[PDB]
């Protein structure tokens, strides 16, 4: 590519990055929209650097294979030398930050279960003791790692139940994981992270809910590769951004209730 | 060299660092007991280092004086060598983070308003079209600097107040700003961390609470003098201790399970 361009690996999920309205006229970063794309500017003008976004090739966010040690994702992105940064709803975990560097948080979540309306289920303890309810997590992301290495009872449990689970529990992106939740008439639950899961529930056809506390608390940041040169100015935009009230502000632009369930 | 015992800077703060009972017959770090006395013990157990908790001088977290530039508190503690660490709720900010170095979080807050119970106040914005009740903060820390700096219309009118109010509103430290809510007959609100407001309203006589929603969203983090050696091994045991949902029960320990005002 270009010099001094940095190459911006992130993940098309909503509504973090999207593509617009009528993007196959367009070009360049001006094909996408969303908390991150406006993020990546604000960043990126408060280091002064030129950039271009690409979607993560494989889709995923970050896992490492236990046979093979091989990372994927925009994680494995950053490790091979694939991409500069990640501008992404990246969960900051110890396995991560063990092989890449991660800003302060820009965003806070937590592990969350979303149901069909009316399903009897109100906790992880509710979703451990049945099996009427299967359950899952999106493949090759922090929440399915959370679970299968928790040794946190209920969660062991759940964890126990759901790696053997047949069919398989386990989705390939959180659009799959929510059609799921849609379709099967109150059988499937989806573990998902508070943000993705709050803004699902203000979106037709106003069908699902998150139930009971979050199951952790964590948040995304800003990844580089260890030891780039980088790090250190995003991670000082970040608190700018943070302090100056522009995080609140994007959040509240792209989780907008514009009414499409109830009275807005 | 040959391992240093390492010197902790810390605060008399409830309740993470408090005397405990007996504390005029003990001595060194056994006078102390509380949530950062626990995290402390954690996180030199899993980096394998000896300490001696000191409460800083000054009683102060810190702030850098407009004229001198010199730094007081914990912050001082650790930009002028007096300390090695600093485990305390001690807020990560720009100002801070371009002079210290800071872990990722072990504890979320946001600045909140403690009310005596019954008082006519649900907002900041409430607060800031009246003047029958007073408001202030903590001197020399984060949410004092906040609204100082802050361009949001409500909280600059809301310091364009402080700044002037006679007698002052501002206070020492946390008892202080506790004693004058509960003291001033519904006429005095205090500019708190939520984390310290929701430990006091379970403390007797039960008589505050905190309205509203967070004015802002920032964590406190394990702080070390800029390019230290310890900061790598301290941020991967918090992020262990939030995986392993130590850090959970810990605050449950300390706010609640201890709580004074009963089971609800
Ligand atoms: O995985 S962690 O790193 N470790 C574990 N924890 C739990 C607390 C124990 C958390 C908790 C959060 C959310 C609270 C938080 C902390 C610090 C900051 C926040 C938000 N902001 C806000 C924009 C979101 C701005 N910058 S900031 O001042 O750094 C994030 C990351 C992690
Ligand atoms: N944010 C997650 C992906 C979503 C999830 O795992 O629920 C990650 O960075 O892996
Ligand atoms: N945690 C704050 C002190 C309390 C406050 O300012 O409300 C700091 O680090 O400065
Ligand atoms: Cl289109
Ligand atoms: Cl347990
Ligand atoms: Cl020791």
Redesign the pocket.
């Known amino acids: 590519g270009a010099n001094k361009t940095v190459v911006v690996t992130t993940i098309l999920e909503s509504p973090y990055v999207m593509m617009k309205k009528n993007h196959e006229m367009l070009e360049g970063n001006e094909r996408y929209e969303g908390y991150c794309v406006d993020l990546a500017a604000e960043i990126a003008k408060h280091c002064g650097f030129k950039y271009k976004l690409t979607i993560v090739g494989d889709g995923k966010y970050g896992a490492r294979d236990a046979d093979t040690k091989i990372w994927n994702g925009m994680v494995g992105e950053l490790v091979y030398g694939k991409a500069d940064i990640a501008i992404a709803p990246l ?3 110890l396995v991560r930050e063990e092989v890449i560097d ?8 937590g592990i969350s279960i979303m149901i069909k309306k009316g399903t009897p289920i109100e906790s992880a303890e509710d979703l451990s003791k049945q099996t009427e309810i299967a359950y899952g997590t999106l493949d090759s992301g922090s929440t399915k790692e959370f679970f299968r290495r928790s040794k946190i009872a209920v969660f062991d449990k759940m964890w126990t139940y759901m790696r053997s689970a047949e069919p398989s529990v386990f989705v390939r992106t959180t659009a799959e994981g929510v059609a799921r939740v849609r379709k099967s008439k109150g059988k499937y639950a989806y573990l998902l992270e508070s943000t993705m899961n709050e803004y699902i529930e203000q979106r037709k056809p106003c069908d699902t809910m998150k139930v009971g506390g979050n199951l ?6 800003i990844a580089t590769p260890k030891g780039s040169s980088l790090g250190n100015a995003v991670n000082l935009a ?2 700018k951004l ?1 302090e100056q009230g522009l ?2 502000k994007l959040k509240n632009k792209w989780w907008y209730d514009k009414g499409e369930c109830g009275s807005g």
């Open positions: 969960t900051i975990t991660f800003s302060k948080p820009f965003m806070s979540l952790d608390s964590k948040g995304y940041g970040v608190l943070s995080l609140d």
